[PDB]
């Protein structure tokens, strides 16, 4: 459509979006920071080990109250988690982007995740019931996601 960071040559690259995905924003953001720059095969293998809890996701900015993991010293950091829903929606989008590379004739064994970002999407509203007859918001924080897979070897 209209992305941030159009690729350096729009012939050796493909792309995919996803809008109003109901993941958390903060958990999807730290997952995408892990995936940025990885080769496409390494990223898929990594993102399925988050769902099996063999390799963690280092939470760096959004980390208040996040516990400390033994797998996180691999990333040079202390605290980490294993976001399952954030990893699964980043596998649907990545499989989508891989098939966008086969529609336009690229070798998908050389793709590298160049650009990735998540944005905050419009919030969804529910309600919660509190002590002395009060209603509070119980909002949700969905996300937009976009990525560019430029191939290089």
């Amino acid at each position: 459509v209209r992305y941030s960071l159009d690729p350096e040559n729009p012939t050796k690259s493909c792309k995919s979006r996803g809008s109003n995905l109901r993941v958390h924003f903060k958990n999807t953001r730290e997952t995408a920071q892990a995936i940025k720059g990885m080769h496409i095969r390494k990223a898929t293998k990594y993102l399925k080990d988050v769902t099996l809890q063999k390799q963690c996701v280092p939470f760096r900015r959004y980390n208040g109250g996040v516990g400390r993991c033994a797998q996180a010293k691999q990333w040079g950091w202390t605290q980490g988690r294993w976001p399952k829903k954030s990893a699964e929606f980043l596998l649907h989008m990545l499989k989508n982007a891989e098939s966008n590379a086969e529609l336009k004739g690229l070798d998908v064994d050389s793709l590298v995740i160049e650009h990735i970002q998540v944005n905050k999407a419009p919030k969804m509203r529910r309600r919660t019931y509190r002590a002395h007859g009060r209603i509070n918001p119980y909002m949700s924080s969905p996300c937009h996601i976009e990525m560019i897979l430029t191939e290089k070897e």
Binding site: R127, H132, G133, R134, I135, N136, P137
Partner: peptide, 25 residues
């Protein structure tokens, strides 16, 4: 969400009442 004016009035009374019981002049 709807905010009820009365819930505040009731709470205020409790706070005022609590101050009187807890405070000796």
């Amino acid at each position: 969400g709807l905010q009820i004016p009365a819930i505040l009035g009731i709470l205020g009374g409790i706070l005022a009442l609590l101050i009187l019981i807890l405070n000796p002049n």
